[PDB]
Amino acid sequence: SEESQAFQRQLTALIGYDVTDVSNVHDDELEFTRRGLVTPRMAEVASRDPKLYAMHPWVTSKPLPEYLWKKIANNCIFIVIHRSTTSQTIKVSPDDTPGAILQSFFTKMASEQDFVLRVCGRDEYLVGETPIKNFQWVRHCLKNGEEIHVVLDTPPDPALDEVRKECDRKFRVKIRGIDIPVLPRNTDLTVFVEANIQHGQQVLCQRRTSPKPFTEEVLWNVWLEFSIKIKDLPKGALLNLQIYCVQLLYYVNLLLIDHRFLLRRGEYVLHMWQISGFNADKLTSATNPDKENSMSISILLDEMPNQLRKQLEAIIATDPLNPLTAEDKELLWHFRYESLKHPKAYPKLFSSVKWGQQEIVAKTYQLLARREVWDQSALDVGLTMQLLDCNFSDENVRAIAVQKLESLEDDDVLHYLLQLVQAVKFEPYHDSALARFLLKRGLRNKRIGHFLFWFLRSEIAQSRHYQQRFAVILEAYLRGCGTAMLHDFTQQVQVIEMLQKVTLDIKSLSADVSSQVISQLKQKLENLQNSQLPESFRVPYDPGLKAGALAIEKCKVMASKKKPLWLEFKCADPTALSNETIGIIFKHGDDLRQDMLILQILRIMESIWETESLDLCLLPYGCISTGDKIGMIEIVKDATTIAKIQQSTVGNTGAFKDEVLNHWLKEKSPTEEKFQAAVERFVYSCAGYCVATFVLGIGDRHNDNIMITETGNLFHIDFGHILGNKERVPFVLTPDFLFVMGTSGKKTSPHFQKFQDICVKAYLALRHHTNLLIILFSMMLMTGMPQLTSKEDIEYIRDALTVGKNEEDAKKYFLDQIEVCRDKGWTVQFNWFLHLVLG
Ligand SMILES: CS(=O)(=O)N1CCc2c(-c3cnc(N)nc3)nc(N3CCOCC3)nc21
Fold this sequence. Notes:
Blueprint: H1 2-15, H2 29-36, H3 38-45, H4 50-55, H5 66-69, E1 77-82, E2 88-92, H6 99-108, E3 116-119, E4 125-126, H7 136-143, E5 148-153, E6 170-179, E7 190-199, E8 202-208, E9 212-213, E10 217-229, E11 238-244, E12 248-255, E13 266-271, E14 273-274, E15 296-301, H8 306-316, H9 326-334, H10 336-339, H11 346-350, H12 358-369, H13 372-376, H14 381-386, H15 395-405, H16 410-423, H17 433-444, H18 446-462, H19 467-478, H20 483-508, H21 515-529, E16 537-539, E17 542-550, E18 556-557, E19 565-571, E20 582-588, H22 592-611, E21 623-627, E22 630-634, E23 639-641, H23 642-647, H24 660-668, H25 675-696, E24 706-709, E25 714-716, H26 735-741, H27 750-767, H28 770-784, H29 796-801, H30 807-824, H31 827-835
Parallel strand pairs: 1-5
Antiparallel strand pairs: 1-2, 3-4, 3-5, 6-10, 6-15, 7-8, 7-9, 7-11, 11-12, 12-14, 13-15, 16-17, 17-19, 18-19, 19-20, 20-22, 21-22, 23-24, 24-25
The chain binds ligand MMD.
């Protein structure tokens, strides 16, 4: 209890919010949830193999893609084992288990004490009953032309990551009145309260008060009787209360049915959220914690025709953004049992239920009992994600989604993780199938767990609307990850807290860069190192990598908007095969939550291309948003911007020259072996970024924001606020790019023919998952793009994907998007140089 009192304070500094401070609660839902998450936590902590949890092999069941077999000559792989400068390369079959590889080294090449293969310089192990081809690090080594180096050392002790012991009346609501301490608005106004009964973005019923003058205190004492009956209220229905003046000024919500299935009784004083200027924050059950500046509100509570089948199939086959008319919904419902045979159709089918009708909901639940086909069908994440978005508030409907997620291997959980955590924002209750799912998979696997921690912590630090809910989920996870990880997270938290201070301090001291600031960093960073900064820590975007000491020599305040710090660290693992530093950018000013979502979709796309045996060489570098307009950014080594390569020859301003990029490429490559591979890396990376950026609607960029490695890998950066008559481009395929591919004006070459053909395989590969990208894009805007003015913004994604327009016209459409880039030349790019200078 005295020892347990301190532990909670340790949990609190890890979490970033105190899950016991009950100043901002009007019921016990959070505590009920903190209490409810004890079973699933203990049930997973007790269920996980201690060894395989401790070493956490990162593996996959997916086939080794075509492009990685072609890299394997004569069906063998070259493992380079190490020990104490005793290297020895070994030929190994792709299907060889790691235990059966130590058998080749120890038992052959020259009771027992069992050891394991760790990757040199990394907390990454090659253990467990998996073929060597199926470990991702191995695949990573193949894809980038690297060589698999490993140390033969002892397993980590499973003891280190153990845990501490533990009526038919019409519904009515009385609006007493509203209360703001200071009415800021300049002129006099009038105001009314709007009370909506909502279920999953549908307003079932609506009342309004009479308008009264806008004063610091405004009382009504009016009963608002609704059309809906108490019997007819579905679990997860919200009382959404809103203040208007015609303009929405304030909102707050309250679950009419609580977490014990009780109707909500009694007096409530709800502190409300103010409105800037839809958005996941609109939907929160959380009240505003700021009890001194926030508007308050006070209330009190108490077989068919072919024509129709074809009409049904044409509806089931439409994208998720295609609306349903009244006519469509009545068909889906009337033929619900025929609709139940088509998983593709569940989202539209469940959007056709009248949730405000107790008898229909009953019929919907018996209908959910006969879901044999849904269960057997192969997991579609696109379809699954869709039943977990803002349009579905029924927990049983959502359960089926999370059910299908149970099938995911860790590797895939990692792809969709970021947006699964964000999807918790659409849960009506703090305790849900999804929140528990995230908890289990986090507890089951340290890699999932690592990123769960940071994704949750990301939101806890910058969302008043959802911090509490996520805090309960993070706490739950932290209480089962073990002492070791608690130790890593604490170390990592200390570092980023330590380094955020410097980032903000340095920013204050300069509105170009000064000599006094450059030494200020030198000194301040020289200080932190002395003894306060931990010895080493996990890099939060690459948890297998442990940063050690700072390379103060290499650190500087960057000469760019918002004065980010360019920091570099020596690796803390001596078995690392280099003295090459770990580069991190620390920035305040940009909303790096947006970058996270965008980079994670890029990773999603690379995975969609692996399915169709494509590899478009994206470099979605690490990004972790750690607070409000603040976070870190991985440094991709050996890279420079396209704008600066132009500026290295042409100069600080002028006409951009087409020859420069190809000279820069050739000037860096040492041979006709590398350069011509570098050119092949460019053709591919350029295509990928051209396609990905086009579909995401962020293809029109200043080439100061496009980069290239000294090996041909092209990649974009800085993705915040890019989603906002003037000239436009679909993507950046400028004449300098084409020059590398061997074309000029409206000409053509073999490398450009490969470009054109790569883009088309890419663009059609993404169109194969139209729905998936639509859901992920729609969710991204609601949960992470503030300034989400309209759903119209979402409809960009369907246009770009050319929904309902055959494979072949789609080949054409995208070929002509390229042709617009060839026509526009340097002009749009010339306008950005102007724009980023012509204030
Ligand atoms: C070209 S630079 O002068 O070195 N510079 C200026 C800004 C910047 C960024 C960056 C990334 N994201 C965001 N939001 N802001 C800046 N990111 C990066 N990198 C990120 C990828 O690795 C290469 C370096 N470099 C930046």
